């Protein structure tokens, strides 16, 4: 002393192994191959809740789950809380009702909190009103060799929560309801597109030229081909090539990879849905977005207004998903709050200096390089996005920020594009697709200028794609939504790790490890005293 | 001369750009923003095929597609083959029926083969019996700037086919039927699991320890965390952790990455479906596989026997998907054809030497290292897999090949596992999952031995996973199927590139480039002469 930091836990593990070893020598198999579960406990509850007090069904069913509680009134009567599908069912181990008495005492002695057990017997409702099962037989299906945390645990410490999801799902079962919700969202999306003739496709994740958006790629290497490859930033280009190929409507709900910073709204690998629809424009896509999200909100309320939160309490607000969404222009709203209305060449030097000095006038300065696009981005970010709470379509961005968006049909130096903002966050991005190969090539020129300027987040010229769209590319509307963030919205959480099963965590130190473990037995030891 | 290799093509491109430029100066927009398509040509055909010869409907509809043919009987009568959704509709441009005569002559002169056009007019059926549309108005939606290949093209040369999928989909539209089929397969799978309470989840693609199967990973690096990461070999471990967490039934249809050789059955990035089902064994999973695939075959015939091919012709055979599938044992069939029946310690040296000499006796030798598992793999591969044509369950492999499969409940030195073989190919792999943490750890030991032996395709010990399963892991059945290969089977193709939209191709040389282009104008020039 005072070393040996994770003493009690090691001791407990060793002793548990010893226990299951003794149990195995006694003629009991701790890990049975097959146990037939005749009914799940939600089905159990749904079927036998009609039972009155002291009533016992003649039916014999078999359930199985994780023991979260083990209490006994005597040696002949034990009560177990068996959890399955995030639902609780009581097991009333009554010795007089158990067929094998020896097995009864051995099993009831051996059962440890955390053990996966199975039981076979009669459904009932006790005098206490607790729906239960009285087992004729029972067995341990998988012994727990460590100490399960109490419910709840780690609710504050996000680290230990998201480092050991397999424990968090057990001690914080409510969290499951998030992920379920997520899978609904996805499914909904699929349906909405599948019913419109869209073809769900799969485009390569490994590339040679990262394009489709503005970011920095993960770099890998293929051995046999002896060549560097890049994990995709966006599936945009390939999907467009599919549209050129003759498949009018395509979509992909896939994993995108971006080597950037990690926060409450950014995971290095995330999930988006991108679709492309021939002979459509961003108006049709606006309507489709309103319809999809509005329906998605109505199938959980079912009004198109959703109740929401707001430190960490329950204060209420409302998100208005009623069609139509509010529509504002990127340059017009920026002009309105500025007082001055921008010089006319937005690409020129004059306007660059002007943005540079309305920047200091509002304390919104950009990290190098300070190109027009980046300065405008920090401007729009620190000034108007902070007030975009209700579902809002931010439309008609300039071209120097939109290389893959088609020219606006009425407004000079603007593009046919919108970004959907909800709760100060970008959820969706959509274009009227640029199908002019000449302008596309010159736009890739115009990106090369930027990545010469120091920017390494600009889009490189893809020659194959250029060839494809040079072979005639239909007028098309394009759409991209962040599944993770929409999930965040609908699940009412302000941390993206709440809707990602295994988020990317910084590998904990030896100090953080030592610490954490030391805490674990600090409290174990305190419980022992 | 004789240089300037891609002369005519360059000239054609330049001239086409000049053409659309002149067209734009004449007051016509080559790339209109929005054209409203009132009806698709399959819907068109479905609705107006009832028309008799010389009959004209009073309805006015608007269609749009790609011009694949342009012929004319006179200057007042032109015939276009407009393709949409891999379907042909004739456009009869009759000048007397066109509203804007000037627009008629300008448009009919400007239209080039490959152009995306839109038309608005009356449906009809001509004297020739050809279902058509007589346009009142029309316009070019997107001009084609290169020469589209004739139908068909490249049917032999797989290279140019799979290098430019956007062209192949146009000139070989039948190929589309493959990918459609694929998306059905996937969907089917989803349904089959969704109806059984399975939760469709997403596990990380970026790892720190590659596990779940036996292969070699792609290596990448995260900047902010300053750490090497690995693209997943299999989602097995994480899904298992989800099962430990309390989610009894999970599945993921995702992208797996393996840095290996490329052939007719191997793409560096492929798609698999993995599910895990608590309180099940590999028997139940056998039945589920029979049911799923049998149903999948019955929903395209609808008998459970499928007609198949077999040099490159149409010779017929039959795949028997009727339940039950034929079941053979890994060691018993290997014994039957051997004559001798293996020594009893399969891990020992004696049996190693024995396999080493029944190997030369059948000319089946292994590349270094020649471990027991690899020798047995080359043995089983070159000897019995060559005769597994009909759907066959190859069951009960030894443990030295199955580190994540549970011990067999009756047979020593064997595991509860099967591999589904169809047409000499592994399509599915399934276990009764190992839930014994001690044996799991010792098995990871037993893999470390191999990767010390020279093998770098063995599985490394995952401590987090070990912790998870040490926290009690329910008896579980696991399943993994190759979507790409199943697609190959159902689409009747012997090349995996036929069911992957953008397969990984070796970046063509300067010589291969020069060649290909030179061929293109060799034939263009021959056509000009
Ligand atoms: N032709 C129109 C195409 C529009 C899609 C475009 N290729 C595109 O990728 O556009 P992005 O904007 O790059 O991504 C759009 C949405 O992705 C979400 N998102 C982006 N980065 C994310 C991250 N690190 N973590 C989680 N989610 C993230 C956002 O909700 C965004 O609305
Ligand atoms: N507990 C049971 C888990 C079984 C799945 C196991 N983790 C696993 O991955 O097992 P594998 O065998 O690694 O992959 C199984 C199927 O994947 C297909 N496949 C594997 N490699 C492929 C490739 N390079 N290209 C295309 N398809 C490929 C096969 O059809 C195989 O049946």
Write out the DSSP string of A391-421: -EEEE---GGG-TTBPBPSSSTT-BSEEEEE
Give the nearest ligand 2 atom to B236 CA.
7
Say yes or no: CB of residue A459 within 6 Å of ligand 1: no
A234 and A98 within one domain: no
CB atoms within 10 A of CB A450: 21
DSSP state of A76: T
Asked if the C-beta of A495 comes within 8 angstroms of chain B's C-beta atoms, the answer is: no
- Looking at chain A, after which residues does the C atom sit over 2.5 Å from the next written N, breaking the chain? 310
A485 annotated to bind ligand: yes
Q: Which tokens hold the place of A105? A: 């005492």
- Resolution of the PDB structure in angstroms: 2.8
- Chain B segment 266-295 residues within 8 A of A by beta carbon are 268-269, 271, 278-281, 283
Q: Which tokens hold the place of A214? A: 């503005």
In this complex, which of A170, A224, A475 lies closest to B141 when CB atoms are compared?
Answer: A475
> What CATH number should be reported for the domain holding residue B126?
2.40.50.140
Asked if the C-beta of A204 comes within 8 angstroms of chain B's C-beta atoms, the answer is: yes
Instruction: Spell out the residues 6+ positions from residue B115 whose beta carbon is closer than 8 angstroms to its own.
Output: A472, B66, B67, B140, B141, B142, B143, B144
B94 and B241 within one domain: no
In angstroms, what is the C-alpha Rg of chain A? Answer: 30
Q: Is B337 exposed, middle or buried (0-12, 13-18, 19+ CB in 10 A)?
A: exposed
B292 and B146 within one domain: no
What length does chain A have? 529
A78 and A61 within one domain: yes
- Taking CA atoms, B236 is separated from A521, B202, B399, in Å, by 32, 12, 18
> What CATH number should be reported for the domain holding residue B498?
3.30.930.10
B485 annotated to bind ligand: yes
Instruction: Spell out the residues 6+ positions from residue A359 whose beta carbon is closer than 8 angstroms to its own.
Output: A365, A366, A375, A378, A379
A225 and A347 within one domain: yes
Nearest to B144 by CA among B111, B171, B168, B172: B111
Among A34, A88, A242, A262, which would you mutate to test the B interface (most chain B Cβ atoms within 10 Å of its Cβ)?
Answer: A34
A347 in Cβ contact with A453 (< 8 Å): no
The residue whose CA is least distant from atom 25 of ligand 1 is A266
Query: Whole domain around residue A402: which residue ranges?
Result: 153-529
Say yes or no: CB of residue A203 within 6 Å of ligand 1: no
Nearest to A203 by CA among A268, A247, A153, A166: A247
Number of domains in chain A: 2
CA distance B464 to chain A (A): 8
**Separation of alpha carbons B377 and B373, rounded Å:** 6
The residue whose CA is least distant from atom 13 of ligand 1 is A213
- Taking CA atoms, A305 is separated from A333, A492, B148, in Å, by 25, 14, 51
- Which residues in B246-283 are b (16+ Cβ under 10 Å) and which e? bbbbbbbbbbbbbbeebeebebbbbbbbbbbbbbbbbe
DSSP state of B113: T
Q: Which tokens hold the place of B140? A: 């070019």
- Which residues in A209-228 are b (16+ Cβ under 10 Å) and which e? ebbbbbbebbebebeeeeee
In angstroms, what is the C-alpha Rg of chain B? Answer: 30
End-to-end CA gap in chain A: 17
End residue of a domain, out of B115, B133, B152: B152
**Separation of alpha carbons B447 and B457, rounded Å:** 9
CB contact under 8 A, A176 and B416: no
A160 and A146 within one domain: no
A119 and A178 within one domain: no
B267 annotated to bind ligand: yes
Q: Which tokens hold the place of B232? A: 């997943």
- Which technique? X-ray
B489 in Cβ contact with B481 (< 8 Å): no
A169 and A52 within one domain: no
**Separation of alpha carbons B48 and B204, rounded Å:** 50
B193 and B136 within one domain: no
What length does chain B have? 529
End residue of a domain, out of B114, B130, B152: B152
Instruction: Spell out the residues 6+ positions from residue B89 whose beta carbon is closer than 8 angstroms to its own.
Output: B41, B44, B45, B63, B65, B81, B82, B83, B131, B132, B133
SS3 A461: coil
Element (H, E) at A69: strand A61-74
- Chain A segment 86-125 residues within 8 A of B by beta carbon are 86, 114-116, 118
Q: Given its phi and psi angles, is residue A395 left (phi above 0), alpha (psi -120 to 50 degrees) or beta?
A: beta
* Residue located via tokens 């399934």: B430
- Taking CA atoms, B184 is separated from A251, B122, B164, B299, B509, in Å, by 14, 35, 24, 11, 37
B128 and B213 within one domain: no
Give the nearest ligand 1 atom to A419 CA.
32
A243 and A212 within one domain: yes
**Separation of alpha carbons B10 and B16, rounded Å:** 10
CB contacts of B216 in chain A (<8 Å) are 223
End residue of a domain, out of B131, B152, B173: B152
**Separation of alpha carbons A226 and A228, rounded Å:** 7
Is-cis flag, bond preceding A147, omega within 30? no
B270 annotated to bind ligand: yes
**Separation of alpha carbons B497 and A357, rounded Å:** 55
Say yes or no: CB of residue B289 within 6 Å of ligand 2: no
A98 in Cβ contact with A137 (< 8 Å): yes
B430 in Cβ contact with B282 (< 8 Å): yes
Mutate to test the pocket of ligand 2, among B238, B256, B422 (most ligand atoms within 8 A of CB): B256
DSSP notation for B224-291: TTTEEEEE-S-SHHHHHHHHHHT--EEEEEEEEE-----BTTB-SEEEEEEEEEET--HHHHHHHHHH
Instruction: Spell out the residues 6+ positions from residue A379 whose beta carbon is closer than 8 angstroms to its own.
Output: A334, A355, A358, A359, A362, A364
A282-298 helix and A483-491 helix, angle to the nearest 10 degrees: 40
**Separation of alpha carbons A137 and A120, rounded Å:** 5
Instruction: Spell out the residues 6+ positions from residue A471 whose beta carbon is closer than 8 angstroms to its own.
Output: A244, B114, B144, B145, B146, B148, B166, B167
Backbone angles phi, psi at B377, to 5 degrees: -70, -40
Cα torsion angle, B294, B295, B296, B299, sign: positive
A384 and A436 within one domain: yes
Q: Which tokens hold the place of A233? A: 């930033």
């Amino acid at each position: 002393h005072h070393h040996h930091h994770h003493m009690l836990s090691k001791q407990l593990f060793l002793n548990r192994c010893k226990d299951v070893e003794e149990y195995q020598k006694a003629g009991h198999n701790p890990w049975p191959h097959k146990f037939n579960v005749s009914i799940t406990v939600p089905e159990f509850i749904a079927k036998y809740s009609g039972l009155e007090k002291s009533q016992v069904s003649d039916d014999i069913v078999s359930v199985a789950g994780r023991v979260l509680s083990k209490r006994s009134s005597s040696s002949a009567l034990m009560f177990i809380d068996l959890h399955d599908s995030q639902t609780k069912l009581q097991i009333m181990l009554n010795k007089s009702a158990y067929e094998n008495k020896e097995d009864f005492v051995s099993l009831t002695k051996m059962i440890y909190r955390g053990d996966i057990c199975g039981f076979t017997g009669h459904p009932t409702r006790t005098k206490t009103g607790e729906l239960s099962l009285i087992p004729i037989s029972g067995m341990i299906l998988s012994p727990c060799l460590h100490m399960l945390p109490s419910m709840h645990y780690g609710l504050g410490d996000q680290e230990t929560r998201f480092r050991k999801r397999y424990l968090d799902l057990i001690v914080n079962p409510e969290s499951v309801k998030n992920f379920v919700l997520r899978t609904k969202v996805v499914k909904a999306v699929r349906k909405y597109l599948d019913d419109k003739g869209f073809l769900e496709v799969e485009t390569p994740i490994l590339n040679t030229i990262p394009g489709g958006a503005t970011a920095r790629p993960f770099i890998t290497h293929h051995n046999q081909l002896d060549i560097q490859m890049y994990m995709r930033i966006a599936p945009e280009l390939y999907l467009k090539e599919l549209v050129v190929g003759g498949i009018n409507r395509v979509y992909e709900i896939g994993r995108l990879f971006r080597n950037e910073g990690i926060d409450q709204t950014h995971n290095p690998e995330f999930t988006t849905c991108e679709f492309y629809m021939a002979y459509a424009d961003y108006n049709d896509i606006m309507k489709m977005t309103e319809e999809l999200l509005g329906n998605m909100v109505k199938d959980i309320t079912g009004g198109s207004t959703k109740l929401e939160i707001k430190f960490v309490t329950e204060k209420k607000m409302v998100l208005d998903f009623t069609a139509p969404f509010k529509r504002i222009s990127y340059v017009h709203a920026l002009e309105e709050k500025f007082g001055e209305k921008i010089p006319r060449p937005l690409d020129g030097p004059e306007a660059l200096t002007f943005l540079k000095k309305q920047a200091i006038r509002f304390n919104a300065i950009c990290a190098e390089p300070q190109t027009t696009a980046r300065v405008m981005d920090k401007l729009f970010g620190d000034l108007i996005e902070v007030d975009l709470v209700q579902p809002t379509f931010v439309c008609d961005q300039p071209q120097l920020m939109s290389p893959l968006a088609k020219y606006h049909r009425s407004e000079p130096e603007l593009t046919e594009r919108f970004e959907l903002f909800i709760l100060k966050r970008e959820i969706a991005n959509a274009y009227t697709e640029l199908n002019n190969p000449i302008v596309q090539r010159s736009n890739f020129e115009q990106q090369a200028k930027d990545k010469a300027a120091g920017d390494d987040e600009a889009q490189l010229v893809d020659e194959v794609f250029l060839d494809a769209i040079e072979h005639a590319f239909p007028p098309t509307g394009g759409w991209g939504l962040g599944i993770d963030r929409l999930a965040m919205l609908l699940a009412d959480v302000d941390n993206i790790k709440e809707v990602i099963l295994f988020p990317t965590m910084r590998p904990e130190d030896e100090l953080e490890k030592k610490a954490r473990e030391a805490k674990e037995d600090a409290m174990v030891a305190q419980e022992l005293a």
